[PDB]
Coordinates of C-alpha atoms and ligand atoms in Angstrom, one line a residue:
X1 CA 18.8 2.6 -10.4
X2 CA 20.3 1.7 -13.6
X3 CA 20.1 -2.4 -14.2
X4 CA 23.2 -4.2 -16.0
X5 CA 20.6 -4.9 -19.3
X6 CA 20.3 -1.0 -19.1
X7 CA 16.5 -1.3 -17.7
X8 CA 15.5 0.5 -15.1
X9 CA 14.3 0.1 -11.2
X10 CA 13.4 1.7 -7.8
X11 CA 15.3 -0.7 -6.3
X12 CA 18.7 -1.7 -7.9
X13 CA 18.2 -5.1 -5.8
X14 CA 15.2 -5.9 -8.4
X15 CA 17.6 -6.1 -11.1
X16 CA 17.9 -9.6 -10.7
X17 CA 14.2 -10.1 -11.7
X18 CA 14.5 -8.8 -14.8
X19 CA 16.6 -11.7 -16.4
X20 CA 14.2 -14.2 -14.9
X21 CA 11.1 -12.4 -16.2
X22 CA 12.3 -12.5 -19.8
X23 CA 14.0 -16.6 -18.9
X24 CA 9.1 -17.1 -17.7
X25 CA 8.0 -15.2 -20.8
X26 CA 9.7 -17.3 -23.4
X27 CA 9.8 -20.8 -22.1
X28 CA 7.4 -20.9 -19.9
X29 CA 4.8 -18.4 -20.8
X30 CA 4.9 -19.7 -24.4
X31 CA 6.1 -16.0 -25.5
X32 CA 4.1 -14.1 -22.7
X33 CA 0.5 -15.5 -23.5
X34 CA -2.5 -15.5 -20.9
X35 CA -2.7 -19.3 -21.6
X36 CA -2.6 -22.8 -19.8
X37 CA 0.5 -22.2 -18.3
X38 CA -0.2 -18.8 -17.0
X39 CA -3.8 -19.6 -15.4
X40 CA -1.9 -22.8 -13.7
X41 CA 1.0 -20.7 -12.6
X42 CA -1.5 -18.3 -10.8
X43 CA -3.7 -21.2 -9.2
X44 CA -0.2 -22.3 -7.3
X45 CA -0.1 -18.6 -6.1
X46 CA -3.1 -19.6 -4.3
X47 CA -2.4 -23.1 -3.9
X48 CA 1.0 -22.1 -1.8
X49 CA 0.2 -19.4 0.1
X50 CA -3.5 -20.5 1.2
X51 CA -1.4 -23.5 3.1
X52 CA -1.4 -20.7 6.1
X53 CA -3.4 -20.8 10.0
X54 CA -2.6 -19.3 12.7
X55 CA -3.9 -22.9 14.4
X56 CA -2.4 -25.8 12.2
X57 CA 0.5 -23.9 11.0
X58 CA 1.7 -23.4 7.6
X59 CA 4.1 -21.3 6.3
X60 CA 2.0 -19.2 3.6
X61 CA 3.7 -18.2 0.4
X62 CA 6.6 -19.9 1.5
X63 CA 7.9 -21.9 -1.8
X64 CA 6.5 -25.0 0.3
X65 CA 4.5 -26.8 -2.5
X66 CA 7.4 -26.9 -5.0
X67 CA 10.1 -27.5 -2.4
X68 CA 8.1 -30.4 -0.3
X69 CA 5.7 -31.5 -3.7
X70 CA 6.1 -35.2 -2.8
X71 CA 4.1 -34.1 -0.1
X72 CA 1.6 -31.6 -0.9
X73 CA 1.1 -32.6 -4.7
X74 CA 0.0 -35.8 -2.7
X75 CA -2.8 -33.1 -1.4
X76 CA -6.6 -34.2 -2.9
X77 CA -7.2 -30.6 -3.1
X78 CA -3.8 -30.2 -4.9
X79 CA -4.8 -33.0 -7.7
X80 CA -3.1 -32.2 -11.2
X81 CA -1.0 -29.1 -9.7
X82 CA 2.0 -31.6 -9.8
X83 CA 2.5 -30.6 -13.7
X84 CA 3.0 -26.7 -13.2
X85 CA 5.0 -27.6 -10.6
X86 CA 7.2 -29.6 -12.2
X87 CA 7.1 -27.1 -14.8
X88 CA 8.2 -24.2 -12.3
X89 CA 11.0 -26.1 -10.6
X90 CA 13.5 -25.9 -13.1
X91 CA 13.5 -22.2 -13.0
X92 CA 13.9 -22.2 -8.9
X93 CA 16.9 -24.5 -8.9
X94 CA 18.4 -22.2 -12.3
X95 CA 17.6 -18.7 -10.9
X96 CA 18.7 -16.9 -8.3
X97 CA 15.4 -16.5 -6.5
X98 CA 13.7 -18.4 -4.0
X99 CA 10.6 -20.8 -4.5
X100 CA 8.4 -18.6 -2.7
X101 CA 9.7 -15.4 -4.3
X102 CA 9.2 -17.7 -7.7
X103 CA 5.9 -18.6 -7.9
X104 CA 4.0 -15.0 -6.5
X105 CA 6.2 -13.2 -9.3
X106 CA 5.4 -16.0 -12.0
X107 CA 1.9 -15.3 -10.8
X108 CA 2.1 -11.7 -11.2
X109 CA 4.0 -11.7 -14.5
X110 CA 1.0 -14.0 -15.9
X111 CA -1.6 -12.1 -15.0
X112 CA 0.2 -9.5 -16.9
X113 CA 0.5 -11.0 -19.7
X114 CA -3.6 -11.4 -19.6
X115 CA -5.6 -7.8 -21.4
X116 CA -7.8 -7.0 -18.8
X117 CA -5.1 -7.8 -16.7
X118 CA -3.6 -5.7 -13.5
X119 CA 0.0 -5.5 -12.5
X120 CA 0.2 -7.1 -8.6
X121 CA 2.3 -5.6 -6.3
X122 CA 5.2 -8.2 -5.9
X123 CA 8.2 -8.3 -2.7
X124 CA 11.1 -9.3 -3.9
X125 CA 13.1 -11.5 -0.4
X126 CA 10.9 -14.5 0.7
X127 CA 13.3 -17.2 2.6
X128 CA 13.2 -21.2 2.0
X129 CA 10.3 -22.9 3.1
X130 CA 10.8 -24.9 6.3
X131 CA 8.8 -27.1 6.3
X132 CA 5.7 -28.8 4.6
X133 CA 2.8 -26.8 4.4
X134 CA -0.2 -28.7 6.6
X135 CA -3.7 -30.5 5.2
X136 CA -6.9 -28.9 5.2
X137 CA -5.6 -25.6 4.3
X138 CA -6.7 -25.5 0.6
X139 CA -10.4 -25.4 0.2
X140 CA -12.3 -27.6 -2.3
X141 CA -15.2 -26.6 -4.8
X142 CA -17.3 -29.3 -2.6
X143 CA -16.7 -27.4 0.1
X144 CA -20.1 -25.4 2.1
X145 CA -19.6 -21.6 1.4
X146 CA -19.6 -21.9 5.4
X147 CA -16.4 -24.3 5.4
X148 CA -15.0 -22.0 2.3
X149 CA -15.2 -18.4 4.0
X150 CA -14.5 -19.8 7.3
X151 CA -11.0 -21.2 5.8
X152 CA -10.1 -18.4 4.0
X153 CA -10.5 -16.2 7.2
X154 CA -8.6 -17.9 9.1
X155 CA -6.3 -17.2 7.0
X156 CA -7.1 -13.9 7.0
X157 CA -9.7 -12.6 4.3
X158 CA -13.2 -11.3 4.3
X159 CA -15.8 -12.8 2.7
X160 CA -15.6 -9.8 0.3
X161 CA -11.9 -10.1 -0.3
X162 CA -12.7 -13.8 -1.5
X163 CA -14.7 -13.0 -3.8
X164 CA -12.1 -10.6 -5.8
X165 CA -9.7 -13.7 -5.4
X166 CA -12.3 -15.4 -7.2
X167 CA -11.6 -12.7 -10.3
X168 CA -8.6 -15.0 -11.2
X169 CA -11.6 -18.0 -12.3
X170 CA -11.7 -15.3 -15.4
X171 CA -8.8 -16.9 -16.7
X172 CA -9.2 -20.3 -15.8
X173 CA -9.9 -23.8 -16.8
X174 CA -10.8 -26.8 -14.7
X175 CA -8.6 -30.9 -15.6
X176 CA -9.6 -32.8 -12.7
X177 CA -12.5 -31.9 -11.7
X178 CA -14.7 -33.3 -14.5
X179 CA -11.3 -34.9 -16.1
X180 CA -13.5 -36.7 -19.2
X181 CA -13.2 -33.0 -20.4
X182 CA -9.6 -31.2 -19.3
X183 CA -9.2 -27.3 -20.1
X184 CA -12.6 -26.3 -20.2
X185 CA -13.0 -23.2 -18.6
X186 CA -14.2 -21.2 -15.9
X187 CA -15.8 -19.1 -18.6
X188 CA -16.3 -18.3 -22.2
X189 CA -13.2 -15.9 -22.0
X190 CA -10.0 -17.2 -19.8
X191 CA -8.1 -15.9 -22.4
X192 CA -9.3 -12.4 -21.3
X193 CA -9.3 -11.4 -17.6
X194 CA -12.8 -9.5 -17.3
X195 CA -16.0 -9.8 -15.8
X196 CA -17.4 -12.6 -17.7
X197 CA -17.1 -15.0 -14.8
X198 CA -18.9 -13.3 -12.4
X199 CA -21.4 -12.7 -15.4
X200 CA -22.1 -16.2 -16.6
X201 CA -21.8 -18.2 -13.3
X202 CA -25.1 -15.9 -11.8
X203 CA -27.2 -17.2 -15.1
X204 CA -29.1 -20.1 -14.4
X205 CA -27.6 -23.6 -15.3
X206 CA -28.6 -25.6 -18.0
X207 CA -26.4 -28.7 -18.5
X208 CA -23.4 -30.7 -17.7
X209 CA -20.7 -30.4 -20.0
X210 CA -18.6 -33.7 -20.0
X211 CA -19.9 -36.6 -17.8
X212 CA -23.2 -35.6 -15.5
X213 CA -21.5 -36.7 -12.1
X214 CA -18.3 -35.1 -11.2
X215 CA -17.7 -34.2 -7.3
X216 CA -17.4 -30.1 -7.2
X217 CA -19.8 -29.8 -10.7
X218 CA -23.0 -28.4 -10.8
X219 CA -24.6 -27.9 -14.0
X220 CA -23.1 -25.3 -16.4
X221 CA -25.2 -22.5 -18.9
X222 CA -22.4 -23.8 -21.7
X223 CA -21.6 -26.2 -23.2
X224 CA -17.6 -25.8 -23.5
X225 CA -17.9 -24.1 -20.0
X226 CA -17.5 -26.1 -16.0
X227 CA -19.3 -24.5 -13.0
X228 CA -17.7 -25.2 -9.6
X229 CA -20.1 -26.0 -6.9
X230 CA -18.3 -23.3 -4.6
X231 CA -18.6 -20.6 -7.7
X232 CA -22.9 -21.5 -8.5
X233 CA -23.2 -21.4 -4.2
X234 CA -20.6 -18.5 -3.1
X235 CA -22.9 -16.5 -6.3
X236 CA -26.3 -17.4 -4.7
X237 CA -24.7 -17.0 -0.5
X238 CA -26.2 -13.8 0.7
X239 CA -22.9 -13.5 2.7
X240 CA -21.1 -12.9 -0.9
X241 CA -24.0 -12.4 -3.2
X242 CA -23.8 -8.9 -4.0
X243 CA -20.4 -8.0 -4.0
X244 CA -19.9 -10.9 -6.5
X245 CA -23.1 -9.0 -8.4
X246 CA -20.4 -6.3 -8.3
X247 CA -17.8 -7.2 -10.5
X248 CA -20.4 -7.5 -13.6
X249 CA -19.5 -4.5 -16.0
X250 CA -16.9 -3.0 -13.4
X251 CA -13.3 -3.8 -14.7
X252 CA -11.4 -1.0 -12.7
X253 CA -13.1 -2.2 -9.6
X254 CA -11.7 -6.1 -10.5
X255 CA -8.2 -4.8 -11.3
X256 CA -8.1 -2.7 -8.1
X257 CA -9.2 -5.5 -5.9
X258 CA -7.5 -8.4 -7.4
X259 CA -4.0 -6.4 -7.7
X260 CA -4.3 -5.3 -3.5
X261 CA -6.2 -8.9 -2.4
X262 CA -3.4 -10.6 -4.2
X263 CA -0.6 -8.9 -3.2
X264 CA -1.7 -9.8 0.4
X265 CA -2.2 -13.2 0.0
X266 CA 1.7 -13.5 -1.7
X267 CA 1.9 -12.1 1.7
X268 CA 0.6 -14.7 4.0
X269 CA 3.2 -15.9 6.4
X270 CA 5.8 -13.5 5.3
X271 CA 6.7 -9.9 6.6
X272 CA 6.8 -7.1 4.2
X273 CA 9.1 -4.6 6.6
X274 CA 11.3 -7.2 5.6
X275 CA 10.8 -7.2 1.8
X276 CA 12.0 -5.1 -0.8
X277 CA 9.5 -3.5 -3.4
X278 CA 10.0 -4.7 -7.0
X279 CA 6.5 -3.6 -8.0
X280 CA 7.8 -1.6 -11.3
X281 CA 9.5 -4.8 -12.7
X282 CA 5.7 -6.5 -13.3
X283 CA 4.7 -5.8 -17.1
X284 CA 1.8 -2.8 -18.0
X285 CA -0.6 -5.4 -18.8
X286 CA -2.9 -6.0 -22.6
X287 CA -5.9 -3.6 -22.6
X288 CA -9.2 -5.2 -22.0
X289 CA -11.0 -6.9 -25.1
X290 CA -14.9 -6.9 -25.9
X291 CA -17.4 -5.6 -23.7
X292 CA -19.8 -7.1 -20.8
X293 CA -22.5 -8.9 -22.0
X294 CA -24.3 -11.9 -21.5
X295 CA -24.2 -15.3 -23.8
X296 CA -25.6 -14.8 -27.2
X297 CA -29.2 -16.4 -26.9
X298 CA -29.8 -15.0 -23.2
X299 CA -31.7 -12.4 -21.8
X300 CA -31.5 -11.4 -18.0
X301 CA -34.6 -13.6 -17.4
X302 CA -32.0 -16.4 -17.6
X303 CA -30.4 -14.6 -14.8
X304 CA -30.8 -15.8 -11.2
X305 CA -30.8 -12.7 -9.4
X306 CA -29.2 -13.4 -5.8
X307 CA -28.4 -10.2 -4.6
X308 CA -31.0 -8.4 -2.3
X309 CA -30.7 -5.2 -1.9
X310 CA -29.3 -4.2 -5.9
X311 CA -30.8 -6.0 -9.0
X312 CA -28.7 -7.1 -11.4
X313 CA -26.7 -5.1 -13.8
X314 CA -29.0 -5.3 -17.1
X315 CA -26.1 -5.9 -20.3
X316 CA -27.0 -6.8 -23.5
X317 CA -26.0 -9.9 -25.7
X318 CA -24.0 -11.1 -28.5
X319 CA -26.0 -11.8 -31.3
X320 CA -26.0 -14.4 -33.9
X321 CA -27.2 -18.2 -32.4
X322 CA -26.2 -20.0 -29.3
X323 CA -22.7 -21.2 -29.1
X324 CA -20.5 -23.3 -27.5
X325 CA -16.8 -22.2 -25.2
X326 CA -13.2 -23.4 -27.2
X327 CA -11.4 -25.4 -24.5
X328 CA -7.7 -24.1 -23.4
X329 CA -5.4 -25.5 -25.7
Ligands
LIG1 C1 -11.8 -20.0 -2.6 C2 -12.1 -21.2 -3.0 C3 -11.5 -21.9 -4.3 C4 -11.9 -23.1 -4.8 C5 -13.0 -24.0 -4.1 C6 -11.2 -23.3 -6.1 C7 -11.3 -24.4 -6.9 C8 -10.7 -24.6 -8.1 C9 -10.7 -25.8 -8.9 C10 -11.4 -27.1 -8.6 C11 -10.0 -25.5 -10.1 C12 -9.8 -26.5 -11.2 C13 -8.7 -27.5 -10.8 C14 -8.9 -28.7 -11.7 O1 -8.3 -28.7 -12.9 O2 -9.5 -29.7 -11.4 C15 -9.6 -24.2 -10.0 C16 -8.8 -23.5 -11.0 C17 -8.1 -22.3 -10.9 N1 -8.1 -21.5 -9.8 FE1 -9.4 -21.8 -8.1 N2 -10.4 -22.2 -6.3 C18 -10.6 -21.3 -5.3 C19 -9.9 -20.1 -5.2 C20 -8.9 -19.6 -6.0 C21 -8.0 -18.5 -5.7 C22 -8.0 -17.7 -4.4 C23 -7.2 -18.3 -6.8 C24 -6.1 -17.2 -6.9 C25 -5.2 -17.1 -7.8 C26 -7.6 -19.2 -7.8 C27 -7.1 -19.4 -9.1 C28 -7.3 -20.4 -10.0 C29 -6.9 -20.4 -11.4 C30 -6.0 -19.3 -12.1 C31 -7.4 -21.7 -12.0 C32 -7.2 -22.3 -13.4 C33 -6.2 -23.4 -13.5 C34 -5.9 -23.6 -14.9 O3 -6.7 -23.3 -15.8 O4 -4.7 -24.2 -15.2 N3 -8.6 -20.0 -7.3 N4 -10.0 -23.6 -8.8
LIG2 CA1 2.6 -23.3 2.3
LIG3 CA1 -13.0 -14.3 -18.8

């Protein structure tokens, strides 16, 4: 089908994406960058849709949180989402999409923008949230791996699954959780969506990078990088362990995961009988940059070794001397 801008789609209802993914990649995406905005518009992929249970309700990737934000930006475990949101919401009310439709194709056009990155499947036809989503839903990186898995099953992954959601922490940068020290990320490369999380959170910590006490913060190999309590833990849980092992050195495995486990969870709550497919609108992503390796003044004695039945993957290391992570500007 032949689009009114003369570019092209399976389904001539996606046309009306295409508008709305140049309107993201210019002012909102900075001029399509895998930056701040990007890595916040994909936590509120998660941050939506996770508010889903077949028990206390929720309405998944329903466009709740930017619809009802007075109420769930008022979330603890949605602290300093409020911004992207209010970032977003300009868009929604200009384009002709909904807020759930919005956010899981902002989400998907990011991660696109990212080399390393994956194009996500994305359905096109999510109705207006109907209500707020519930408490409890979103987990926090205090959280036990127990209370973490537990609440993403319910909502319907595996502790596998979780684990390639947890790919997205590549290209990612924590502001409240240590907030003496805001963008400081997930790991020495959020700019690049690769392996390097799941790489640097299994060596063993050495410091804290802002101010030693921080709820959710354990002690990080960087300085200029945060570990999350739930990352070090879910790294170390035998339940997760060696799958997480898994994603070090293997990129295609990463992309194939993180494109299907995503597409599911812009799934939750919503049918996709009823959906259309817009899947070809979503951007061939950057190729990836640099290779696997671990921090320059490390060896894989520095490496705690969690997974029992497979050692870890031995890389080498950048030379030169010890350095310390950029923060996200
Ligand atoms: C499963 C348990 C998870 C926990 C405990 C957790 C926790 C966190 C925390 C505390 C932050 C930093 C927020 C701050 O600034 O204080 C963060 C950032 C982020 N999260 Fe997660 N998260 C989880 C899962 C996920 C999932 C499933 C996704 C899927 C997209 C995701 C995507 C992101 C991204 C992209 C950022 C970076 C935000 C930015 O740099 O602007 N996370 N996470
Ligand atoms: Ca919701
Ligand atoms: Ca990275």
């Amino acid at each position: 089908a032949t689009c009114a801008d003369g570019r092209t789609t399976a389904n001539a209802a996606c046309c009306v994406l295409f508008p709305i993914l140049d309107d993201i990649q210019e002012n909102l995406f900075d001029g399509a960058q895998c930056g701040e905005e990007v890595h916040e518009s994909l936590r509120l992929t998660f941050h939506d849709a996770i508010g889903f249970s077949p028990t206390l309700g929720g309405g998944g990737a329903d466009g709740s949180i930017i619809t009802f934000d007075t109420i769930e930006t008022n979330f603890p475990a949605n602290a300093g989402i409020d911004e992207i949101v209010s970032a977003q919401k300009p868009f929604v009310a200009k384009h002709n999409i909904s807020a759930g439709d919005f956010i899981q194709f902002a989400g998907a056009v990011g991660v696109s923008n990212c080399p390393g990155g994956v194009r996500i499947p994305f359905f096109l036809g999510r109705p207006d949230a109907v209500a707020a989503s519930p408490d409890h839903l979103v987990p926090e990186p205090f959280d036990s791996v127990d209370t973490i898995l537990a609440r993403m099953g319910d909502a319907g992954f595996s502790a596998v699954e979780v684990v390639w959601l947890l790919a997205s922490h590549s290209i990612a940068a924590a502001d409240k959780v240590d907030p003496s020290i805001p963008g400081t990320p997930f790991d020495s490369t959020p700019g690049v969506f690769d392996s390097q999380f799941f790489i640097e959170t299994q060596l063993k910590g050495r410091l804290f990078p802002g101010t030693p006490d921080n709820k959710g913060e354990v002690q990080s190999p960087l300085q200029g990088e945060i570990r999350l309590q739930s990352d070090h833990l879910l790294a170390r849980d035998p339940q997760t362990a060696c799958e997480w092992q898994s994603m070090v050195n293997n990129q295609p495995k990463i992309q194939n995961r993180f494109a299907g486990t995503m597409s599911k969870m812009a799934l939750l709550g919503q049918d996709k009988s009823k959906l259309i497919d817009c899947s070809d609108i979503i951007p061939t992503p950057p190729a990836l940059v640099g290779a696997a390796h671990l921090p320059a003044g490390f060896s894989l004695s520095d490496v705690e070794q969690a997974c029992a039945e497979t050692p870890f993957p031995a890389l080498t290391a950048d030379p030169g001397p010890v350095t310390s992570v950029p923060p996200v500007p």
